[PDB]
Design an enzyme around this catalytic site. Structure first.
Site, PDB file in Angstrom:
ATOM      1  N   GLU A 184      12.988   8.975 -20.798  1.00  0.00           N
ATOM      2  CA  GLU A 184      12.602  10.388 -20.844  1.00  0.00           C
ATOM      3  C   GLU A 184      11.854  10.839 -19.577  1.00  0.00           C
ATOM      4  O   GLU A 184      11.858  12.029 -19.258  1.00  0.00           O
ATOM      5  CB  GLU A 184      11.799  10.719 -22.119  1.00  0.00           C
ATOM      6  CG  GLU A 184      12.417  10.247 -23.440  1.00  0.00           C
ATOM      7  CD  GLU A 184      13.730  10.868 -23.895  1.00  0.00           C
ATOM      8  OE1 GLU A 184      14.578  10.120 -24.435  1.00  0.00           O
ATOM      9  OE2 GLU A 184      13.894  12.104 -23.760  1.00  0.00           O
TER      10      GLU A 184
ATOM     11  N   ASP B 136      12.164  21.976 -16.528  1.00  0.00           N
ATOM     12  CA  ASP B 136      13.165  21.073 -17.105  1.00  0.00           C
ATOM     13  C   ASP B 136      14.610  21.489 -16.801  1.00  0.00           C
ATOM     14  O   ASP B 136      14.847  22.427 -16.040  1.00  0.00           O
ATOM     15  CB  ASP B 136      12.964  20.953 -18.619  1.00  0.00           C
ATOM     16  CG  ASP B 136      12.968  22.298 -19.316  1.00  0.00           C
ATOM     17  OD1 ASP B 136      13.430  23.285 -18.704  1.00  0.00           O
ATOM     18  OD2 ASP B 136      12.510  22.370 -20.475  1.00  0.00           O
TER      19      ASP B 136
END
Ligand SMILES: CC1(C)CN2C(CS/C(=N\C3CCCCC3)NC3CCCCC3)=CSC2=N1
Ligand SMILES: CC1(C)CN2C(CS/C(=N\C3CCCCC3)NC3CCCCC3)=CSC2=N1
Ligand SMILES: CCCCCCCC/C=C\CCCCCCCC(=O)OC[C@H](O)CO
Ligand SMILES: CCCCCCCC/C=C\CCCCCCCC(=O)OC[C@H](O)CO
Ligand SMILES: CCCCCCCC/C=C\CCCCCCCC(=O)OC[C@H](O)CO
Ligand SMILES: CCCCCCCC/C=C\CCCCCCCC(=O)OC[C@H](O)CO
Ligand SMILES: CCCCCCCC/C=C\CCCCCCCC(=O)OC[C@H](O)CO
Ligand SMILES: CCCCCCCC/C=C\CCCCCCCC(=O)OC[C@H](O)CO
Lengths: 418, 418
Positions: free
Chosen positions: A194, A203
């Site tokens: 992650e 993101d």
């Protein structure tokens, strides 16, 4: 004249405990191919290097008590074998430090060259240079008539050669492997899917995020996002956050998403049946897909404690192809555990004990270095006792050949009965 | 007695061409901070190391002709400076090899520690150990009355120390930096976004693919996909393909997608206005988004030859956040070029010339090593001429201090007029 009693006893112990010790290792290592780690491939090389030397010890015992009856060829053979065992053993341990550096610091991508070192370079780096280092034993080691007995050791044209070969010994034997070993473990101790980011970032979709995938706000405003996560920690940070702060935030991301697993009835008999490590792998799966996503699997097999049957079934999904490297880790975690300590301790205590055997000998040689180089000028009675405490420490040092098999003793043994 | 004429002339040349040469470097390097590459930070260290030594050369000139009038302190100073210049200069060049290894082998992630080495470790690895290596010059270097003149050099208790310091010199000066340099360039010569895969794989969606993102077929059948791309190369391969085969397939993927750019009128005056490198960056953008996707940009600025104005505009899109690392490379390619040869040649020819200056001196010392160690036993007239050809080669070797500034000469100069 008591060196006839001290030395042949110490030489007899190492040959007997070494022939049995190192003998069993080579024998057992060959008997099976299934159970073989990288360290075990190196420890086999160490066993061959030590077995070859321990067998020459009866010749060392006879030479201490009586004479060199064996001849000029065998005088060259024992010295050559001593040079191989000296540099190889230490350099194999340097490769075990190098292998431990790759297995821990490169967690993911490691086994790739860890095999390249263990099976291919282990010869180019350890066997080939060590056998080349024996060249002076062929030239210099010779039998000669010391008064009343046949003395056998390296004889050079002048005393300058003693320094050319003592400095070379310290270099290839202790300073160079010592730098490599101390470098590897220095990196290991300090440094011990992650992604982790300690400064605010956008993101895949352009939303403000920080730490292990924690989502601040979908608002494009810079300050409004910061103030939305300045109150999540309790400080004015202007973005930048500490490593322990991110660990708490990830723990708060888990502690809130871990409650949801216990409420969803579809996976709750699966999560509960799962022991610790495999339990964490499912949580790693939850943060990626979500409680509804993961509950659509490959799950009736994982709960029934059918390990390999669920693993191959999970590898037949789209999540396996969407995130190839990210999914393979999760699947392997269900089959086995945290493979993405006890092994590290065994090699650490092996390397620490290796230099421990050689420590009293290092001290002895260090004093003669000061004697020949004129740093300490105590007459001839003192040097006669320094040399009297080199041969004993050298004999005591040879116990190192019994360190590798002694650590294989009581393997899997339950120390319970009394 | 002609060494009074040969040596002071050679010493005078290096001091004069070195004070001017290395002098200009230190001066010019300080005058600007804008133009500073990693190699230029190291070459400044090399200049300080050489300037410090060249200034001691007039003392070497006077000592060759007449006497050591300078005293006992300055005899210790010149030897210390000789030890600093000897090990530092060679080890700075070992760091230039290490920096070149990081800048090329780690293309993407490099500048990260390349700065760590150049500004932080360059002291711990080169200045601190070299200054510690000078310790014997403080102890051993002394002025003494050679018959009729004051001789100044290292005097030890015995001739064994000559070997302890000759072996140490070869080790820290030539064998150890030589291994590092030869390792770095050995990796560089042999090894010289979308990803390359030589064996069939499933993409993000699970379709059979091979090479640089080439799509075989959406059919889940294994053999049907292979046979669909066994005819694309013209061989029965069972999957596995060569590196040059994949390059041809990527070229066929480009040669077909490069024709489409010349047909779409929206970007054709943009692609044509673009020189080679920036032209390839747009093609790298095409394979990712497609001809309709990229033609929706940030393009009227790129065609007008407005470089930095389009670069910051492209960084304000969603493609910049979707693929952060993959987009930053493309944006930087429009601003500048292939930064993701001439610099590599300059350092290669610097290192090759450094060992070239030191080669005739190495040969000389190598002969005395055989003399002291009794490998060659020619009397006293021969050794008197071996030593007669060490001082000249050592003086000729010092020219190395003029290699670093000589390579900075004619920089940007157009060799056209005649
Ligand atoms: C480093 C080395 C291989 C060299 N060496 C030495 C010097 S040779 C030597 N005999 C042997 C040493 C071991 C190899 C075979 C010769 N001396 C005496 C001779 C009189 C009786 C006691 C030993 C002693 S222990 C040792 N270890
Ligand atoms: C390695 C070293 C620093 C050591 N050395 C030497 C040996 S000392 C030396 N004087 C100087 C050498 C350079 C440093 C200062 C002393 N000898 C003679 C004395 C008579 C006249 C010619 C030189 C010569 S060149 C050289 N380079
Ligand atoms: C099997 C045990 C062999 C152990 C041999 C140890 C005996 C030591 C030895 O050889 O002692 C000779 C004695 O010093 C004569 O003078
Ligand atoms: C002294 C004898 C020491 C005990 C010998 C044990 C060595 C052995 O056979 O070890 C098994 C194998 O290496 C484990 O993976
Ligand atoms: C182990 C010893 C084996 C037997 C020693 C050879 C026989 C002999 O001549 O013994 C010499 C005696 O030990 C005096 O030094
Ligand atoms: C500025 C030029 C200086 C160059 C000095 C070079 C002259 C060489 C020298 O000093 O020669 C002395 C001669 O050998 C006496 O016997
Ligand atoms: C001899 C003199 C040689 C010429 C001196 C050139 C050195 C210099 O000043 O170089 C500029 C700078 O290092 C470039 O980036
Ligand atoms: C450079 C020389 C500088 C002048 C040399 C010192 C004066 C002197 O006494 O000269 C000795 C003469 O060179 C005989 O060796």
């Amino acid at each position: 004249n008591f060196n006839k009693i001290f030395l042949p006893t110490i030489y007899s112990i190492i040959f007997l405990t070494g022939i049995v010790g190192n003998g069993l290792v080579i024998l057992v290592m060959g008997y099976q191919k299934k159970l073989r780690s990288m360290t075990d491939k190196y420890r086999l090389h160490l066993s061959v290097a030590d077995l070859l030397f321990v067998i020459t010890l009866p010749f060392w015992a006879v030479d201490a008590v009586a004479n060199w009856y064996f001849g000029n060829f065998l005088c060259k053979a024992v010295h050559v074998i001593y040079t191989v065992n000296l540099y190889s053993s230490v350099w194999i341990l340097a490769f075990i430090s190098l292998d431990r550096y790759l297995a821990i610091v490169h967690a993911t991508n490691s086994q790739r060259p860890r095999k390249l070192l263990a099976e291919k370079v282990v010869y180019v780096g350890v066997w080939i240079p060590a056998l080349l280092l024996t060249i002076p034993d062929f030239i210099f080691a010779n039998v000669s008539e010391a008064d009343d007995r046949y003395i056998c050791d390296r004889f050079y044209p002048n005393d300058l050669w003693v320094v050319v070969f003592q400095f070379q010994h310290i270099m290839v034997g202790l300073i160079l492997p010592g730098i490599v070993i101390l470098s590897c473990y220095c990196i290991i101790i300090s440094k011990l899917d992650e992604g982790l980011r300690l400064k605010i970032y956008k993101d895949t979709e352009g939303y403000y995020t920080i730490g292990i995938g924690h989502l601040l706000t979908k608002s494009p405003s810079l300050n409004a996002a910061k103030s939305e996560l300045d109150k999540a920690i309790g400080r004015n940070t202007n973005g930048v956050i500490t490593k322990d702060e991110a660990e708490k935030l990830f723990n708060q991301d888990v502690d809130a998403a871990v409650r949801g697993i216990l409420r969803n009835a579809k996976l709750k008999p699966v999560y509960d049946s799962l022991d610790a490590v495999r339990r964490a792998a499912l949580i790693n799966m939850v943060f990626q897909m979500g409680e509804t996503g993961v509950a659509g699997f490959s799950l009736r097999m994982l709960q029934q404690k059918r390990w390999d049957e669920a693993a191959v079934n999970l590898a037949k999904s789209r999540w396996y192809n969407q995130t190839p490297n990210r999914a393979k880790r999760v699947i392997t975690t269900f089959r086995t555990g945290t493979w993405d300590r006890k092994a590290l301790k065994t090699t650490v205590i092996l390397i620490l004990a290796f230099f421990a055997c050689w420590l009293p000998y290092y001290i002895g040689i260090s004093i003669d270095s000061f004697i020949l180089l004129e740093i300490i000028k105590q007459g001839c009675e003192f040097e006669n006792t320094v040399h009297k405490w080199i041969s004993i420490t050298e004999a005591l040092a040879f116990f190192h050949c019994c360190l590798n098999p002694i650590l294989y003793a009581f393997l899997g043994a339950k120390f319970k009965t009394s």
